[PDB]
Amino acid sequence: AAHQEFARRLALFSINVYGKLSGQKPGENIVFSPFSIQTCAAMARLGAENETATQLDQGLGLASSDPEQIAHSFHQVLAAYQDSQILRIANKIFVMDGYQLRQEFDQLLSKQFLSAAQSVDFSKNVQAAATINNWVEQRTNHLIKDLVPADVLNSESRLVLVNAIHFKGTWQHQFAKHLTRPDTFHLDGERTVQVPMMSLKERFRYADLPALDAMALELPYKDSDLSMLIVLPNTKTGLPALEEKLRLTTLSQITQSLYETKVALKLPRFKAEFQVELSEVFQKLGMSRMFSDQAEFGKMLQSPEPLKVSAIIHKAFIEVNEEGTEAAAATGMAVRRKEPIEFFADHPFTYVLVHQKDLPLFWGSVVRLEE
């Protein structure tokens, strides 16, 4: 249905972005919220026209070229997440003093994307960035700071679109802290580090993935249909090969493979933070016109001023420990006038924080750990 299609399109967008990020920022732990990125960009699409809009439709994987339909489909997902004890999602638009949104854009953002709105003076760009970034902090339990630098805002800025997402869940099956001990995490064939390694024997949904030379495990969050999917290469140095093989399948095909079994799990206690300016990723996914002097965003403002995207920034944070997971992310877009089975995660792996086994909220990799 609608959820499954939305999820499928988002999963493909996710692996698309992940591949470009891995290439742009090699050797570091990736974490991002594809949901946050797709939602923020879809909000911008509502104000786009012509080839600019078509590129966004195709690069984001939207199911319609009709702004009303696109908005309705995001509303279905957002409205579901309003009634949650674990998840909080928030949208807001920040608009230059004296500029008015077009009626349709305004109504779709407010009613379908549940977006708030505030007028700001971008010519006072230090002040405007503080307003934006303080709001993001409030929406992410202070985990995402300084999202939009003052230096990307100026008197030519006209609006900033922001999506924020915050997650705090408890494991259905928590780890016992007294079992956590320093243990070896293999960075590669020449390098290892000692890290706090959590240990738990329990029944989990599991899949052997021989076609991907990997194995997967699902860790559910308590009182929810949310979970963490871990995909673990069979070889210590296998993650780059696995990241390529993932493109040959889908998240839903992976999770459909899972079955409950007794597992001896080892998993590092870890935190990761990641930040990226996404313009190059978008260009590489075929969404270049939005940054150019040919950008078409004539449906955003009543003003006849031509507009383009000057920056897209994403930041994310995740903390995994014995009790559960806390994660957060935000995306800002600035627009301007022109017997047990062993599952030992002791070498690099990829993970996905998923809703209903098929909709990715967060996606990351652990390739290195300190201390």
Side-chain angles (χ1 to χ4, degrees):
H3 167 98
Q4 295 85 0
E5 195 198 31
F6 183 96
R8 206 149 47 224
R9 291 162 175 273
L10 176 62
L12 180 54
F13 181 66
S14 296
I15 184 59
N16 289 357
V17 168
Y18 178 88
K20 302 299 183 226
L21 292 174
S22 183
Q24 185 178 325
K25 292 193 159 219
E28 82 176 272
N29 295 345
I30 295 170
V31 59
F32 71 110
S33 171
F35 181 78
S36 177
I37 296 169
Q38 197 193 51
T39 297
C40 189
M43 287 195 288
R45 160 66 177 91
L46 302 182
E49 299 188 281
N50 302 329
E51 185 182 351
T52 298
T54 300
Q55 286 184 4
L56 282 159
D57 287 346
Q58 291 174 5
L60 299 175
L62 308 186
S64 172
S65 65
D66 180 0
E68 231 161 40
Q69 293 177 335
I70 291 161
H72 167 254
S73 295
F74 278 85
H75 182 254
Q76 291 180 299
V77 179
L78 291 168
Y81 291 154
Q82 288 179 297
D83 183 38
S84 175
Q85 307 181 297
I86 288 168
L87 269 173
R88 293 275 181 277
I89 301 168
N91 297 315
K92 188 157 183 179
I93 189 172
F94 301 84
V95 186
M96 178 62 120
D97 288 342
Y99 288 82
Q100 243 175 265
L101 307 183
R102 296 193 61 175
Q103 176 158 222
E104 183 65 13
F105 187 60
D106 181 41
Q107 276 169 13
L108 293 176
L109 291 168
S110 179
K111 290 190 294 185
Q112 309 298 322
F113 282 84
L114 310 175
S115 186
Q118 182 177 2
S119 192
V120 299
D121 187 354
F122 286 117
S123 76
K124 294 169 178 186
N125 57 308
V126 181
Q127 180 185 78
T131 300
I132 293 170
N133 294 334
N134 292 339
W135 180 83
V136 170
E137 283 199 42
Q138 287 295 116
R139 301 289 78 77
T140 60
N141 197 24
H142 298 279
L143 296 172
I144 307 298
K145 301 183 161 182
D146 310 309
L147 177 69
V148 180
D151 55 43
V152 306
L153 307 175
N154 57 40
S155 67
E156 305 311 278
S157 309
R158 293 293 175 263
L159 61 94
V160 177
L161 281 165
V162 187
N163 167 274
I165 178 169
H166 178 267
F167 171 100
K168 188 161 168 36
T170 301
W171 298 121
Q172 175 170 352
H173 305 293
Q174 291 182 50
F175 303 80
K177 284 193 288 320
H178 76 266
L179 292 186
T180 298
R181 59 176 182 183
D183 209 354
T184 307
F185 184 87
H186 301 259
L187 301 161
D188 64 22
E190 296 174 331
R191 305 173 145 98
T192 72
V193 286
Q194 297 300 107
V195 304
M197 189 69 69
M198 309 184 300
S199 170
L200 172 65
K201 284 143 165 157
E202 183 51 71
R203 287 181 69 80
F204 291 112
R205 302 181 78 245
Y206 159 90
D208 195 16
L209 303 169
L212 299 186
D213 198 40
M215 300 173 181
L217 196 72
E218 178 182 48
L219 308 184
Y221 296 101
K222 187 187 187 193
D223 295 332
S224 86
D225 49 7
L226 294 155
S227 63
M228 183 176 282
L229 180 71
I230 300 165
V231 193
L232 181 68
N234 289 343
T235 62
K236 291 178 196 318
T237 61
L239 184 57
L242 171 63
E243 289 175 345
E244 289 303 324
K245 281 264 180 97
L246 285 173
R247 310 169 69 197
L248 303 176
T249 188
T250 66
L251 177 62
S252 295
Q253 285 168 276
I254 292 165
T255 56
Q256 274 180 244
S257 292
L258 300 166
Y259 64 90
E260 182 180 295
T261 200
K262 195 159 48 154
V263 174
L265 172 65
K266 292 184 175 167
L267 184 69
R269 186 167 80 208
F270 73 94
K271 291 175 189 182
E273 287 174 282
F274 183 78
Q275 63 184 88
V276 61
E277 212 284 345
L278 284 171
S279 294
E280 186 177 285
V281 166
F282 272 51
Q283 289 167 330
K284 282 177 184 189
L285 296 178
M287 297 175 280
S288 50
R289 193 169 176 90
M290 60 194 290
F291 311 103
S292 84
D293 284 330
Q294 288 70 52
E296 297 127 332
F297 285 104
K299 288 227 242 129
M300 287 183 158
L301 307 175
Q302 284 171 21
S303 164
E305 291 175 18
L307 308 171
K308 68 183 179 180
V309 174
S310 58
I312 308 173
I313 297 134
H314 187 75
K315 296 193 182 193
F317 170 101
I318 187 165
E319 176 182 359
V320 171
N321 60 26
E322 288 86 350
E323 179 170 9
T325 300
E326 186 169 15
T331 309
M333 292 177 72
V335 178
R336 66 166 285 158
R337 65 160 309 173
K338 286 177 202 183
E339 173 30 48
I341 289 171
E342 298 190 333
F343 195 97
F344 295 171
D346 60 10
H347 56 276
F349 60 91
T350 189
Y351 63 85
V352 192
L353 213 169
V354 293
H355 174 228
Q356 281 186 29
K357 297 176 39 165
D358 65 357
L359 196 156
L361 299 173
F362 291 84
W363 196 310
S365 63
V366 176
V367 308
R368 68 182 178 181
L369 292 172
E370 270 280 20
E371 143 155 65

PDB file of all heavy atoms in Angstrom, residues 117-140:
ATOM      1  N   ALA A 117       6.348  28.026  11.195  1.00  0.00           N
ATOM      2  CA  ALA A 117       6.906  29.099  10.380  1.00  0.00           C
ATOM      3  C   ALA A 117       7.316  30.257  11.251  1.00  0.00           C
ATOM      4  O   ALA A 117       6.646  30.567  12.246  1.00  0.00           O
ATOM      5  CB  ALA A 117       5.903  29.566   9.339  1.00  0.00           C
ATOM      6  N   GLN A 118       8.401  30.919  10.865  1.00  0.00           N
ATOM      7  CA  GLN A 118       8.868  32.082  11.603  1.00  0.00           C
ATOM      8  C   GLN A 118       9.564  33.041  10.654  1.00  0.00           C
ATOM      9  O   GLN A 118      10.274  32.622   9.745  1.00  0.00           O
ATOM     10  CB  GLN A 118       9.810  31.650  12.728  1.00  0.00           C
ATOM     11  CG  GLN A 118      10.318  32.785  13.603  1.00  0.00           C
ATOM     12  CD  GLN A 118      11.192  32.291  14.732  1.00  0.00           C
ATOM     13  OE1 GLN A 118      11.450  31.094  14.857  1.00  0.00           O
ATOM     14  NE2 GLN A 118      11.661  33.212  15.559  1.00  0.00           N
ATOM     15  N   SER A 119       9.344  34.329  10.868  1.00  0.00           N
ATOM     16  CA  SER A 119      10.019  35.365  10.099  1.00  0.00           C
ATOM     17  C   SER A 119      11.346  35.722  10.772  1.00  0.00           C
ATOM     18  O   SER A 119      11.404  35.881  11.992  1.00  0.00           O
ATOM     19  CB  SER A 119       9.112  36.593   9.980  1.00  0.00           C
ATOM     20  OG  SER A 119       9.621  37.503   9.025  1.00  0.00           O
ATOM     21  N   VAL A 120      12.415  35.837   9.987  1.00  0.00           N
ATOM     22  CA  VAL A 120      13.721  36.197  10.529  1.00  0.00           C
ATOM     23  C   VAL A 120      14.428  37.188   9.602  1.00  0.00           C
ATOM     24  O   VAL A 120      14.101  37.298   8.420  1.00  0.00           O
ATOM     25  CB  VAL A 120      14.628  34.949  10.732  1.00  0.00           C
ATOM     26  CG1 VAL A 120      13.994  33.967  11.719  1.00  0.00           C
ATOM     27  CG2 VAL A 120      14.910  34.262   9.414  1.00  0.00           C
ATOM     28  N   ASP A 121      15.400  37.902  10.153  1.00  0.00           N
ATOM     29  CA  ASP A 121      16.213  38.853   9.392  1.00  0.00           C
ATOM     30  C   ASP A 121      17.541  38.204   9.019  1.00  0.00           C
ATOM     31  O   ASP A 121      18.463  38.170   9.825  1.00  0.00           O
ATOM     32  CB  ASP A 121      16.444  40.125  10.221  1.00  0.00           C
ATOM     33  CG  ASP A 121      17.149  41.230   9.438  1.00  0.00           C
ATOM     34  OD1 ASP A 121      17.561  40.988   8.287  1.00  0.00           O
ATOM     35  OD2 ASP A 121      17.300  42.341   9.991  1.00  0.00           O
ATOM     36  N   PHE A 122      17.635  37.686   7.796  1.00  0.00           N
ATOM     37  CA  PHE A 122      18.843  36.999   7.365  1.00  0.00           C
ATOM     38  C   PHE A 122      20.018  37.956   7.174  1.00  0.00           C
ATOM     39  O   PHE A 122      21.174  37.521   7.137  1.00  0.00           O
ATOM     40  CB  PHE A 122      18.584  36.228   6.078  1.00  0.00           C
ATOM     41  CG  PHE A 122      17.757  34.976   6.273  1.00  0.00           C
ATOM     42  CD1 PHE A 122      16.510  34.852   5.683  1.00  0.00           C
ATOM     43  CD2 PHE A 122      18.245  33.921   7.022  1.00  0.00           C
ATOM     44  CE1 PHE A 122      15.755  33.693   5.849  1.00  0.00           C
ATOM     45  CE2 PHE A 122      17.504  32.759   7.193  1.00  0.00           C
ATOM     46  CZ  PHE A 122      16.253  32.647   6.605  1.00  0.00           C
ATOM     47  N   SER A 123      19.743  39.252   7.050  1.00  0.00           N
ATOM     48  CA  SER A 123      20.837  40.215   6.941  1.00  0.00           C
ATOM     49  C   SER A 123      21.583  40.255   8.280  1.00  0.00           C
ATOM     50  O   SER A 123      22.794  40.491   8.321  1.00  0.00           O
ATOM     51  CB  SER A 123      20.330  41.606   6.533  1.00  0.00           C
ATOM     52  OG  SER A 123      19.715  42.272   7.615  1.00  0.00           O
ATOM     53  N   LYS A 124      20.862  40.005   9.370  1.00  0.00           N
ATOM     54  CA  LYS A 124      21.486  39.745  10.664  1.00  0.00           C
ATOM     55  C   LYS A 124      21.735  38.248  10.758  1.00  0.00           C
ATOM     56  O   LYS A 124      21.088  37.529  11.526  1.00  0.00           O
ATOM     57  CB  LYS A 124      20.610  40.244  11.812  1.00  0.00           C
ATOM     58  CG  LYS A 124      20.442  41.766  11.836  1.00  0.00           C
ATOM     59  CD  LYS A 124      19.364  42.180  12.829  1.00  0.00           C
ATOM     60  CE  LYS A 124      19.215  43.684  12.917  1.00  0.00           C
ATOM     61  NZ  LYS A 124      18.262  44.033  14.005  1.00  0.00           N
ATOM     62  N   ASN A 125      22.673  37.767   9.952  1.00  0.00           N
ATOM     63  CA  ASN A 125      22.781  36.331   9.725  1.00  0.00           C
ATOM     64  C   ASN A 125      23.250  35.549  10.960  1.00  0.00           C
ATOM     65  O   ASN A 125      22.907  34.390  11.114  1.00  0.00           O
ATOM     66  CB  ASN A 125      23.712  36.052   8.548  1.00  0.00           C
ATOM     67  CG  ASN A 125      25.101  36.650   8.738  1.00  0.00           C
ATOM     68  OD1 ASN A 125      25.252  37.836   9.034  1.00  0.00           O
ATOM     69  ND2 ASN A 125      26.124  35.823   8.569  1.00  0.00           N
ATOM     70  N   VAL A 126      24.025  36.182  11.836  1.00  0.00           N
ATOM     71  CA  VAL A 126      24.441  35.526  13.077  1.00  0.00           C
ATOM     72  C   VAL A 126      23.214  35.267  13.952  1.00  0.00           C
ATOM     73  O   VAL A 126      23.056  34.195  14.537  1.00  0.00           O
ATOM     74  CB  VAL A 126      25.453  36.372  13.847  1.00  0.00           C
ATOM     75  CG1 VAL A 126      25.895  35.665  15.122  1.00  0.00           C
ATOM     76  CG2 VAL A 126      26.660  36.657  12.964  1.00  0.00           C
ATOM     77  N   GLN A 127      22.354  36.271  14.039  1.00  0.00           N
ATOM     78  CA  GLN A 127      21.112  36.161  14.798  1.00  0.00           C
ATOM     79  C   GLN A 127      20.181  35.107  14.184  1.00  0.00           C
ATOM     80  O   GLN A 127      19.624  34.259  14.890  1.00  0.00           O
ATOM     81  CB  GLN A 127      20.438  37.535  14.852  1.00  0.00           C
ATOM     82  CG  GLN A 127      19.124  37.605  15.601  1.00  0.00           C
ATOM     83  CD  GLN A 127      18.494  38.982  15.484  1.00  0.00           C
ATOM     84  OE1 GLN A 127      17.894  39.314  14.463  1.00  0.00           O
ATOM     85  NE2 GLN A 127      18.650  39.799  16.519  1.00  0.00           N
ATOM     86  N   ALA A 128      20.023  35.140  12.866  1.00  0.00           N
ATOM     87  CA  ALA A 128      19.110  34.212  12.193  1.00  0.00           C
ATOM     88  C   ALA A 128      19.585  32.762  12.329  1.00  0.00           C
ATOM     89  O   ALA A 128      18.781  31.842  12.517  1.00  0.00           O
ATOM     90  CB  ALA A 128      18.964  34.588  10.741  1.00  0.00           C
ATOM     91  N   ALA A 129      20.895  32.551  12.258  1.00  0.00           N
ATOM     92  CA  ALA A 129      21.435  31.203  12.429  1.00  0.00           C
ATOM     93  C   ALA A 129      21.198  30.714  13.863  1.00  0.00           C
ATOM     94  O   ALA A 129      20.878  29.539  14.084  1.00  0.00           O
ATOM     95  CB  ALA A 129      22.939  31.164  12.080  1.00  0.00           C
ATOM     96  N   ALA A 130      21.325  31.619  14.829  1.00  0.00           N
ATOM     97  CA  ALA A 130      21.100  31.262  16.228  1.00  0.00           C
ATOM     98  C   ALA A 130      19.648  30.861  16.432  1.00  0.00           C
ATOM     99  O   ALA A 130      19.370  29.860  17.083  1.00  0.00           O
ATOM    100  CB  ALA A 130      21.486  32.430  17.163  1.00  0.00           C
ATOM    101  N   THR A 131      18.723  31.623  15.853  1.00  0.00           N
ATOM    102  CA  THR A 131      17.302  31.267  15.915  1.00  0.00           C
ATOM    103  C   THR A 131      17.035  29.869  15.348  1.00  0.00           C
ATOM    104  O   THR A 131      16.363  29.044  15.977  1.00  0.00           O
ATOM    105  CB  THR A 131      16.445  32.307  15.161  1.00  0.00           C
ATOM    106  OG1 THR A 131      16.631  33.592  15.772  1.00  0.00           O
ATOM    107  CG2 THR A 131      14.972  31.942  15.207  1.00  0.00           C
ATOM    108  N   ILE A 132      17.566  29.608  14.163  1.00  0.00           N
ATOM    109  CA  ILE A 132      17.375  28.327  13.512  1.00  0.00           C
ATOM    110  C   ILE A 132      17.996  27.214  14.333  1.00  0.00           C
ATOM    111  O   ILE A 132      17.362  26.196  14.589  1.00  0.00           O
ATOM    112  CB  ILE A 132      17.969  28.335  12.102  1.00  0.00           C
ATOM    113  CG1 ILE A 132      17.164  29.292  11.223  1.00  0.00           C
ATOM    114  CG2 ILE A 132      17.964  26.917  11.486  1.00  0.00           C
ATOM    115  CD1 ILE A 132      17.795  29.571   9.892  1.00  0.00           C
ATOM    116  N   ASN A 133      19.240  27.412  14.744  1.00  0.00           N
ATOM    117  CA  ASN A 133      19.991  26.356  15.402  1.00  0.00           C
ATOM    118  C   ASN A 133      19.516  26.081  16.814  1.00  0.00           C
ATOM    119  O   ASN A 133      19.588  24.946  17.278  1.00  0.00           O
ATOM    120  CB  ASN A 133      21.477  26.703  15.401  1.00  0.00           C
ATOM    121  CG  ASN A 133      22.044  26.718  14.005  1.00  0.00           C
ATOM    122  OD1 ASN A 133      21.519  26.044  13.113  1.00  0.00           O
ATOM    123  ND2 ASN A 133      23.094  27.506  13.793  1.00  0.00           N
ATOM    124  N   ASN A 134      19.042  27.117  17.501  1.00  0.00           N
ATOM    125  CA  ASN A 134      18.410  26.921  18.807  1.00  0.00           C
ATOM    126  C   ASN A 134      17.136  26.074  18.683  1.00  0.00           C
ATOM    127  O   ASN A 134      16.883  25.190  19.509  1.00  0.00           O
ATOM    128  CB  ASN A 134      18.103  28.277  19.465  1.00  0.00           C
ATOM    129  CG  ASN A 134      19.375  29.033  19.869  1.00  0.00           C
ATOM    130  OD1 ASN A 134      20.438  28.432  20.028  1.00  0.00           O
ATOM    131  ND2 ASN A 134      19.270  30.352  20.018  1.00  0.00           N
ATOM    132  N   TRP A 135      16.334  26.335  17.652  1.00  0.00           N
ATOM    133  CA  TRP A 135      15.129  25.533  17.413  1.00  0.00           C
ATOM    134  C   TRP A 135      15.504  24.060  17.168  1.00  0.00           C
ATOM    135  O   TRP A 135      14.930  23.151  17.772  1.00  0.00           O
ATOM    136  CB  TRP A 135      14.339  26.090  16.228  1.00  0.00           C
ATOM    137  CG  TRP A 135      13.097  25.313  15.938  1.00  0.00           C
ATOM    138  CD1 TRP A 135      11.877  25.445  16.554  1.00  0.00           C
ATOM    139  CD2 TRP A 135      12.959  24.251  14.993  1.00  0.00           C
ATOM    140  NE1 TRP A 135      10.985  24.537  16.023  1.00  0.00           N
ATOM    141  CE2 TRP A 135      11.626  23.794  15.065  1.00  0.00           C
ATOM    142  CE3 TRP A 135      13.829  23.651  14.079  1.00  0.00           C
ATOM    143  CZ2 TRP A 135      11.152  22.767  14.260  1.00  0.00           C
ATOM    144  CZ3 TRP A 135      13.356  22.630  13.281  1.00  0.00           C
ATOM    145  CH2 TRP A 135      12.026  22.194  13.378  1.00  0.00           C
ATOM    146  N   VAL A 136      16.510  23.826  16.328  1.00  0.00           N
ATOM    147  CA  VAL A 136      16.968  22.458  16.071  1.00  0.00           C
ATOM    148  C   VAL A 136      17.435  21.780  17.358  1.00  0.00           C
ATOM    149  O   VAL A 136      17.104  20.615  17.596  1.00  0.00           O
ATOM    150  CB  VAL A 136      18.085  22.434  15.002  1.00  0.00           C
ATOM    151  CG1 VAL A 136      18.735  21.051  14.897  1.00  0.00           C
ATOM    152  CG2 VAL A 136      17.504  22.837  13.657  1.00  0.00           C
ATOM    153  N   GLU A 137      18.170  22.501  18.206  1.00  0.00           N
ATOM    154  CA  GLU A 137      18.590  21.927  19.485  1.00  0.00           C
ATOM    155  C   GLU A 137      17.397  21.497  20.324  1.00  0.00           C
ATOM    156  O   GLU A 137      17.419  20.438  20.951  1.00  0.00           O
ATOM    157  CB  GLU A 137      19.435  22.910  20.284  1.00  0.00           C
ATOM    158  CG  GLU A 137      20.877  23.010  19.779  1.00  0.00           C
ATOM    159  CD  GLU A 137      21.838  23.602  20.802  1.00  0.00           C
ATOM    160  OE1 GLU A 137      21.737  23.248  21.996  1.00  0.00           O
ATOM    161  OE2 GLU A 137      22.709  24.403  20.402  1.00  0.00           O
ATOM    162  N   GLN A 138      16.359  22.319  20.328  1.00  0.00           N
ATOM    163  CA  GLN A 138      15.181  22.048  21.148  1.00  0.00           C
ATOM    164  C   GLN A 138      14.434  20.817  20.618  1.00  0.00           C
ATOM    165  O   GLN A 138      13.759  20.124  21.381  1.00  0.00           O
ATOM    166  CB  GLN A 138      14.256  23.267  21.169  1.00  0.00           C
ATOM    167  CG  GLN A 138      14.752  24.439  21.989  1.00  0.00           C
ATOM    168  CD  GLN A 138      14.844  24.113  23.465  1.00  0.00           C
ATOM    169  OE1 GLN A 138      15.928  24.109  24.042  1.00  0.00           O
ATOM    170  NE2 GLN A 138      13.706  23.837  24.083  1.00  0.00           N
ATOM    171  N   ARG A 139      14.554  20.560  19.318  1.00  0.00           N
ATOM    172  CA  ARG A 139      13.873  19.449  18.663  1.00  0.00           C
ATOM    173  C   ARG A 139      14.699  18.154  18.659  1.00  0.00           C
ATOM    174  O   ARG A 139      14.195  17.109  18.241  1.00  0.00           O
ATOM    175  CB  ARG A 139      13.515  19.807  17.210  1.00  0.00           C
ATOM    176  CG  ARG A 139      12.604  21.045  17.028  1.00  0.00           C
ATOM    177  CD  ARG A 139      11.153  20.839  17.475  1.00  0.00           C
ATOM    178  NE  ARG A 139      10.985  20.916  18.916  1.00  0.00           N
ATOM    179  CZ  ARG A 139      10.963  22.042  19.627  1.00  0.00           C
ATOM    180  NH1 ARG A 139      11.106  23.225  19.042  1.00  0.00           N
ATOM    181  NH2 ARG A 139      10.802  21.981  20.940  1.00  0.00           N
ATOM    182  N   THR A 140      15.947  18.218  19.121  1.00  0.00           N
ATOM    183  CA  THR A 140      16.851  17.061  19.091  1.00  0.00           C
ATOM    184  C   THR A 140      17.496  16.763  20.441  1.00  0.00           C
ATOM    185  O   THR A 140      18.532  16.097  20.508  1.00  0.00           O
ATOM    186  CB  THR A 140      17.986  17.256  18.064  1.00  0.00           C
ATOM    187  OG1 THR A 140      18.752  18.423  18.408  1.00  0.00           O
ATOM    188  CG2 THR A 140      17.412  17.374  16.636  1.00  0.00           C
TER     189      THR A 140
END
